[PDB]
Amino acid sequence: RHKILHRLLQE
Amino acid sequence: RHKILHRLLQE
Amino acid sequence: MLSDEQMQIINSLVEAHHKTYDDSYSDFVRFRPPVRLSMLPHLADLVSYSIQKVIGFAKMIPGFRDLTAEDQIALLKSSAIEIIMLRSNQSFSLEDMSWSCGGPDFKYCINDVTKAGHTLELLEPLVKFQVGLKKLKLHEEEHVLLMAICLLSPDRPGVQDHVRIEALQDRLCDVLQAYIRIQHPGGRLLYAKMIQKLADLRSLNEEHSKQYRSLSFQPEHSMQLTPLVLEVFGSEVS
Amino acid sequence: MLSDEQMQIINSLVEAHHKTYDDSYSDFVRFRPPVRLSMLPHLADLVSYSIQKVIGFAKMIPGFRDLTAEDQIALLKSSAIEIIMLRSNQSFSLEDMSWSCGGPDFKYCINDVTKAGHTLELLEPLVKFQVGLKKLKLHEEEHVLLMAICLLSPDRPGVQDHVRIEALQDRLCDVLQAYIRIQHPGGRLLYAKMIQKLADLRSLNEEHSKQYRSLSFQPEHSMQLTPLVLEVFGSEVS
Ligand SMILES: C=C1CC[C@H](O)C/C1=C/C=C1\CCC[C@@]2(C)[C@H]1CC[C@@H]2[C@@](C)(O)CCC=C(C)C
Ligand SMILES: C=C1CC[C@H](O)C/C1=C/C=C1\CCC[C@@]2(C)[C@H]1CC[C@@H]2[C@@](C)(O)CCC=C(C)C
């Protein structure tokens, strides 16, 4: 779930 | 499931 | 007088905004071109790009990165459209009642947004919000603090650590009040006015969410959106 | 000599292709512009648009619309990339080893496709397939019949009514053989050659699916795709 969001919230 | 495909396969 | 901890907060937020708001609008040429729901491809690309910027800003807000991934997502999904409406004020022009982002190709009026599905039920309060916001003549410090306060609202669905988010928001609110009192001449009624705008955004978010359901439920329109717009304006829960 | 029922099939397929393949490439200006994974936004928009065309063609194939929605989807998800590769031959040029669709902006070489993520492991057999296909000098009747045979292959995962799909494909194959024998001068080895190309497409589909997983697994790349590309090249089962 929320694949793009999780990735963009990384570093 | 396959929301766009189902709609495009209609009329 | 303002303290060092309050100053460092302002410094961090202005830096965050300067790193995420491109005043040149140079990337707009990379979007699907505007067509004058002919405007939906261009405005979907505009919103998606703006979402990435809102993510970039939020990560630079002191404390936001310390929240859980689930709290970070809950805040963004609920506040993204409101932050977009706030940050869009920088391109808004009282003379044209439109958002101007470079050439006439990237000048959006009320009619361009109707060609993206949407109605005057959203666009009339939105233009009225943009005019009222522009009229406040906010310093950049106030503008970035309002965006950060809006994003860190603990009264959003899906939020778990209400206490921590509320303590982060309370601290930002104190910074704003003290900034207005000391640095904004004749700003005695401004903090109250800025907080009213936050309430106006909740109403605009409600109307947008209602209208969004209308296009998201028609696959011929929803297919024109971007995967990021679909995920962020989506109804999925962590 | 060819019968009326076989002729009506050819008439239906040529009509279907003329209604779905725009020789002017006029809609290409509506895509995110090409950048020389800089090419991924433009080529994702190109593939998505081509998918809509493949859907339009398939619906006009006699018998396809009579299949269940689940069989129609299973066929399209499995064959879409192969139909795209087949129909792209119309823009392919032996002189440049590139697909030319109007101006130099819409001329795609091997390098443009590497800037969309992808490798020579796919692009070298694909260009070699395009050259071999172009060299066959197919009449439009043969080209549209090969696309229809490719789309109606019963040996695709997810397919339920194998019998009916096989009977539709067998009938199309008979039409092609009879067309080549009667109307294609010196085409004695052509049917065998066209069937070999169908086998080449299975291998190109395999390599593409492998490479697609690589970009679909990196959300910074997958977010650049369209919702239709994600759904059609997706791994979801009816
Ligand atoms: C997004 C920015 C920030 C950067 C720049 O200042 C330009 C700007 C303009 C924003 C606008 C002008 C067009 C319509 C929008 C973007 C409205 C803000 C909200 C509104 C909506 C309601 O139409 C968005 C929803 C529409 C979609 C998803 C197509
Ligand atoms: C799609 C058409 C049909 C209409 C016209 O004749 C033009 C054309 C060109 C197709 C090409 C030239 C660019 C790269 C593609 C489109 C390749 C066909 C397959 C290949 C792939 C492998 O790169 C597609 C996968 C790429 C994605 C999803 C970005």
Q: What is the DSSP string of C139-208?
A: -HHHHHHHHHHHHT-S-STT---HHHHHHHHHHHHHHHHHHHHHHSTT-TTHHHHHHHHHHHHHHHHHHH
Q: Which amino acid is at A7?
A: R
Chain D residue whose CA is closest to A8: D220
The helix (H) or strand (E) run that includes residue D99 is: strand D98-100
Sequence-separated (6 or more) residues with CB below 8 Å from residue C160:
C68, C70, C71, C74
Distance in Å, alpha carbon of C220 to nearest chain B alpha carbon: 7
Q: Which amino acid is at C90?
A: Q
Closest CA to C127 of C207, C228, C7, C9: C207
Residue D217, chain A, CB below 8 Å: the answer is: no
Handedness of CA D149, D143, D20, D63 (dihedral sign): negative
Residue D219, chain A, CB below 8 Å: the answer is: yes
Neighbouring C-alpha atoms within 13 Å toward the C-beta of D192: 3
Going from the C-alpha of C235 to that of each of C76, C166, C227, the distances in angstroms are: 13, 24, 14
Sequence-separated (6 or more) residues with CB below 8 Å from residue C121:
C207, C211
CA-CA distance, D140 to D124, in Å (whole number)? 26
CA-CA distance, C74 to C232, in Å (whole number)? 10
**Longest CA–CA separation in chain A, Å:** 19
Given an 8 Å threshold on Cβ–Cβ distance, is A6 in contact with C76?
A: no
Q: Is D94 exposed, middle or buried (0-12, 13-18, 19+ CB in 10 A)?
A: exposed
Q: Is C109 exposed, middle or buried (0-12, 13-18, 19+ CB in 10 A)?
A: middle
Distance in Å, alpha carbon of B7 to nearest chain D alpha carbon: 10
CA-CA distance, D92 to D133, in Å (whole number)? 10
D11 CA to centre of own chain: 20
Ligand that comes closest to the CA of residue C207: 1
| SS3 category, D107 | strand
Contacts of C55 in chain A (CB under 8 A): 5, 8-9
Work out how many CB contacts closer than 8 A connect A with D. 10
Q: Which amino acid is at C79?
A: S
CA-CA distance, C138 to C146, in Å (whole number)? 10
| SS3 category, D198 | helix
Q: How far is the CA of D210 from the centre of ligand 1 (A)?
A: 37
Q: Is the CB of C226 within 6 Å of ligand 1?
A: no
Closest CA to D149 of D134, D166, D164, D130: D166
Q: Are D53 and B8 contacting, i.e. CB atoms less than 8 angstroms apart? A: no
User: Determined by which method?
Assistant: X-ray
CA-CA distance, C225 to C42, in Å (whole number)? 9
Q: How far is the CA of C88 from the centre of ligand 1 (A)?
A: 7
Which pair of tokens denotes residue D224? 């650049």
Rounded to 5°, the CA angle D117-C76-C82 comes to 115
Shortest-distance Cα residue to atom 6 of ligand 2: D88
Cβ contact A–D (≥3 pairs, < 8 Å): yes
Q: How far is the CA of D43 from the centre of ligand 2 (A)?
A: 7
| SS3 category, C113 | helix
| A5: number of Cβ within 10 Å | 23
Shortest-distance Cα residue to atom 21 of ligand 1: C113
| SS3 category, D153 | coil
Sequence-separated (6 or more) residues with CB below 8 Å from residue C74:
C156, C157, C158, C159, C160, C238
Distance spanning both ends of chain D, measured CA to CA: 42
| Domain ranges across chain C | 1-238
Residue B2, chain C, CB below 8 Å: the answer is: no
Given an 8 Å threshold on Cβ–Cβ distance, is B1 in contact with D55?
A: no
| C225: number of Cβ within 10 Å | 23
Per DSSP, what are the bridge partners of residue D98?
D93
Pick the atom of ligand 2 nearest to D208's CA.
22
Q: How far is the CA of D86 from the centre of ligand 2 (A)?
A: 10
Q: What is the CA radius of gyration of chain B?
A: 6
Q: What is the CA radius of gyration of chain C?
A: 18
Residue D227 phi/psi, 5-degree rounding, is -55, -35
CA-CA distance, D195 to D198, in Å (whole number)? 5
CA-CA distance, C88 to B4, in Å (whole number)? 31
Closest CA to C43 of C105, C96, C112: C112
Which pair of tokens denotes residue C186? 């004749």
Residue D116 phi/psi, 5-degree rounding, is -125, 10
Distance in Å, alpha carbon of D227 to nearest chain B alpha carbon: 8
Residues enclosing ligand 2, CB less than 6 A? D 40, 43-44, 46-47, 50, 84-85, 87-88, 90-91, 99, 101, 108, 113, 116, 208, 229
Residue matched to tokens 């790009």: C49
CA-CA distance, C47 to D97, in Å (whole number)? 38
CA-CA distance, C197 to C203, in Å (whole number)? 10
Q: What is the 3-state secondary structure (H, E, C) of C193-204?
A: HHHHHHHHHHHH
Closest CA to C10 of C142, C138, C137: C142
Per DSSP, what are the bridge partners of residue D100?
D107
| SS3 category, C107 | strand
Shortest-distance Cα residue to atom 8 of ligand 1: C88
| C237: number of Cβ within 10 Å | 12
Contacts of C69 in chain D (CB under 8 A): none
Q: Is the CB of C113 within 6 Å of ligand 1?
A: yes
Q: How far is the CA of C43 from the centre of ligand 1 (A)?
A: 7
Sequence-separated (6 or more) residues with CB below 8 Å from residue D133:
D86, D89, D92, D197
| D65: number of Cβ within 10 Å | 12
Which pair of tokens denotes residue C46? 């505009």
CATH class of D1-238: mainly alpha
CA-CA distance, D61 to D57, in Å (whole number)? 7
Q: What share of chain A is helix, strand, coil (3-state, %, to 5)?
A: 55, 0, 45
Sequence-separated (6 or more) residues with CB below 8 Å from residue C151:
C54, C57, C58, C61, C64, C75, C76, C79, C83
Per DSSP, what are the bridge partners of residue C98?
C93
CA-CA distance, C212 to C205, in Å (whole number)? 10
Given an 8 Å threshold on Cβ–Cβ distance, is B4 in contact with D228?
A: yes
Q: How many residues does chain A have?
A: 11
Q: What is the CA radius of gyration of chain D?
A: 18
Mutate to test the pocket of ligand 1, among C81, C88, C120, C131 (most ligand atoms within 8 A of CB): C88
Q: How far is the CA of C216 from the centre of ligand 1 (A)?
A: 17
Cβ contact B–A (≥3 pairs, < 8 Å): no
Can you give the resolution of this entry in Å?
2.2
Contacts of B3 in chain D (CB under 8 A): 231
